[PDB]
């Protein structure tokens, strides 16, 4: 079955580092330099064996064709109003990038406002972030090339969609917030660094600053408004209060849902914005999240997790700011996570809750917090919303496993608040009625009950005969909720597959306690939860080890790679996308320093001892038993993934191929594909998305020998 040879890869046996007395050899450390001839040759040789492997069987072509057909459906974002105009994003079906449209009224003819597709041949220039001026007459937008986190901000006058000369460089992980006087916009930039800043570099990102750009000037004239030179990892994002009176500064360090909150009454500036603002340090620690919802004069409504792991709404009066004085507007729910809150039509609050990994949406009174209206939803997720304080209507977008979903509209000026379907699209070829979604709760090793969604064709016999695709993430307070995936439904329909999503600890599904259950000393909980999910699917007859594929990306790539090391006997196939593989060195590169709040840092003896136990790069080991080998493994990364630098996957695949791949009993392939002009994934053009899923399921089909079902 394996008709290729793994490439020659030099081992630097002298590359030995001492971590608190524990010696670690890193023979592929040289793969950390993306620019070397050695690394470039390594990538070329690896792609040279992977691509022919993926493309040998006609299944790739059948899948690609079906994906191209089925993914070709109209894709809309919610309408949103800015000034006197409406905007929405729309893809006719197969455009590489969705297009931003404008209309002068809801019944008015729409026209193209911003079309990213004309910015490159291959759709690899993508919108990343945008902000309209308060009056809706000016527009700032970020552009990222080749999938990099790096942004260039450009500007337009909305009337006539006129290009303006303003260009902002060195923007990354940035806010965009216009002052309501329409003079300029806050944003973040990083200082100059040696070498490249295009997404191919690994340089750590420190000393992010907050600037104010006056429209009509050169970037070099921009005002420095906040900086933290004594705290190089701090990141301060600005937003304007709804009345335009205050700049709110949310300072973060790491990835925990916490922030400092400082404010600036702009009217108290001595002569407008001219330098470091007169910041008032309302919350000056990282003990809780304070997410601005709205204010009425000095009374500020925040979504918080302070003493409230499932989140709640509090009012803090800037004139009486001590914690003991804060008012609880909407108390914490016992179990349901308050995901997000928006203020609309002056005195309404839109609250979105997560109840057992499904969304609900409710309208509350701002003055009392009292529930006023429940917006009815089927089982699934709210993935889009519009309606700001001055707006008198909302739009919201619902999606689920089995249908692309619906945009709803609700006119909030009406006495009876009845939502109506505004836009709905169905995909011909995938009849939702043929499939079912079930939710179960399985006990993990320590007895903790974990949610899992299972999607499958109705009427299947649970005889262990079905191929299964089990997805997980498990970290960073991210909740993995139902979403429409054409690519996964093709696996079900055309490969006879069962889909599963395990809501393992580390995620946000049951609030901050769920998140804390899968981080730091307890990261092993994630891997245990995920392995127990696999065991559930097997025990209950959905699948069998040899027919089971697991998949995850980034922190999810770490998840599946670790599970391959820990329980190789459990899985037939592993697809790890853009994964964090070197847990000892992740903090050294680009923004990886931010992830130590979930993982710890190997600089600490205590943390090193957690990390060394599960680090994928450091736990590649031949299975003891003669009858057990590693699952088939495919690593996917890209050369501009500056979120998770590709060296992670490069070093990991060299290690897999050397330790496991050289062994006689290993007949399952261990492969990497490194894409070009792509990065971590956000903004990836449609054409590349299609290639990627075609690669993924062709890999599964070849390794598990699955026949296409027409």
């Amino acid at each position: 079955m394996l008709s290729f040879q793994y490439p020659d890869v030099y081992r630097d046996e002298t590359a030995i580092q001492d971590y608190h007395g524990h010696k670690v050899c890193d023979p592929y450390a040289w793969l950390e330099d993306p620019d070397s001839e050695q690394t470039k040759a390594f990538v070329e040789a690896q792609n040279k064996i992977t691509v022919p492997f993926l493309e040998q069987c006609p299944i790739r072509g059948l899948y690609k064709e079906r994906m191209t057909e089925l993914y070709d459906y109209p894709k809309y974002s919610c309408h949103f109003k800015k000034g006197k105009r409406y905007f929405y994003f729309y893809n006719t079906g197969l455009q590489n990038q969705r297009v931003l449209y404008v209309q002068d009224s809801l019944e008015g003819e729409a026209r193209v406002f911003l079309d990213p597709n004309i910015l490159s041949d291959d759709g690899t220039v993508a919108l990343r972030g945008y902000a309209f001026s308060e009056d809706g007459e000016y527009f700032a937008y970020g552009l990222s090339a080749s999938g990099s986190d790096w942004v260039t901000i450009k500007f337009m006058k909305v009337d006539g969609a006129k290009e303006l000369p303003d260009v902002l460089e060195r923007v990354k992980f940035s806010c965009m917030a216009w002052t309501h006087d329409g003079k300029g916009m806050f944003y973040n930039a990083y200082p100059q660094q040696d070498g490249k800043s295009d997404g191919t570099e690994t340089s750590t990102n420190l000393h992010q600053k907050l600037y104010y750009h006056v429209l009509g000037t050169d970037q070099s004239e921009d005002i420095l408004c906040a900086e933290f030179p004594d705290e190089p990892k701090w990141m301060g994002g600005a937003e304007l209060s709804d009345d335009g009176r205050y700049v709110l500064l949310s300072i973060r360090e790491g990835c925990d849902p916490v922030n400092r909150l400082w404010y600036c009454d702009l009217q108290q500036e001595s002569n407008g914005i001219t330098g470091i603002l007169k910041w008032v340090k309302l919350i000056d620690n990282f003990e809780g999240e304070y997410d601005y919802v709205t204010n009425e004069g000095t009374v500020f409504t925040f979504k918080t997790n302070r003493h409230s792991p499932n989140y709640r709404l509090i009012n803090i009066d800037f004139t009486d700011p001590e914690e003991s004085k804060w008012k609880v507007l909407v108390p914490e729910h016992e179990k349901d996570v308050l995901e997000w809150v928006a203020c609309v039509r002056s005195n309404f609050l839109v609250l979105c809750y997560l109840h057992d990994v499904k969304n609900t949406l409710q309208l509350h009174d701002l003055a009392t917090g009292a529930l006023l209206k429940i917006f009815p939803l089927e089982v699934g997720s709210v993935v889009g919303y519009s309606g700001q304080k001055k707006d008198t209507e909302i739009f919201y977008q619902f999606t689920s496993f089995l249908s692309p979903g619906i945009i709803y509209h609700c006119d909030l000026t009406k006495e009876e608040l009845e939502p109506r379907v505004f836009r709905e699209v169905t995909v011909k070829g995938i009849d939702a009625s043929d499939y079912q979604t079930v939710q179960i709760f399985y006990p993990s090793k320590d007895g903790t009950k974990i949610p899992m969604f299972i999607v499958h064709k109705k009427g299947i016999k649970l005889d262990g005969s079905h191929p299964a695709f089990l997805y997980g993430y498990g970290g960073f307070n991210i909740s993995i909720t139902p979403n429409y995936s054409v690519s996964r439904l093709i696996f079900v329909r055309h490969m006879g597959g069962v889909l599963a999503v395990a809501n393992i600890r580390g995620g946000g599904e049951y609030g901050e306690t769920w998140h804390k259950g899968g981080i730091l000393a307890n990261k092993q909980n994630c891997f245990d939860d995920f392995q127990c999910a696999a065991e559930y699917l097997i025990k209950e007859g959905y699948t069998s080890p040899k027919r089971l594929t697991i998949n995850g990306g980034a922190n999810g790539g770490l998840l599946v790679a670790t599970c391959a090391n820990q329980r190789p006997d459990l899985f037939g196939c592993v697809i790890a996308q853009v994964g964090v593989m070197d847990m000892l060195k992740f903090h050294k590169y680009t923004i990886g320093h931010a992830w130590t709040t979930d993982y710890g840092c190997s600089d600490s003896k205590q943390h090193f001892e957690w990390l060394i136990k599960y680090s994928p790069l450091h736990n590649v080991k031949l299975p003891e038993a003669d009858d057990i080998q590693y699952p088939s493994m495919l690593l996917l990364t890209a050369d501009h993934d500056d979120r998770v630098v590709p060296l992670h996957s490069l070093k990991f695949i060299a290690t897999l191929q050397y330790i496991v791949g050289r062994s006689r009993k290993q007949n399952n392939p261990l492969l990497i594909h490194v894409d070009t002009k792509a990065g971590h994934g956000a903004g990836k053009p449609t054409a590349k998305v299609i290639e990627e899923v075609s690669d993924m399921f062709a890999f599964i089909a070849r390794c598990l020998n699955i026949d296409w079902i027409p």
């Binding site: 986190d149 992980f173 990141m235 990835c255 970290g475 960073f476 991210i478 980034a554 922190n555 770490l558 853009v578 964090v580 992740f586 923004i591 990886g592 931010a594 992830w595 979120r643 998770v644 956000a682």
Partner: peptide, 4 residues
């Protein structure tokens, strides 16, 4: 959004 700077999580992995």
């Amino acid at each position: 959004g700077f999580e992995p």
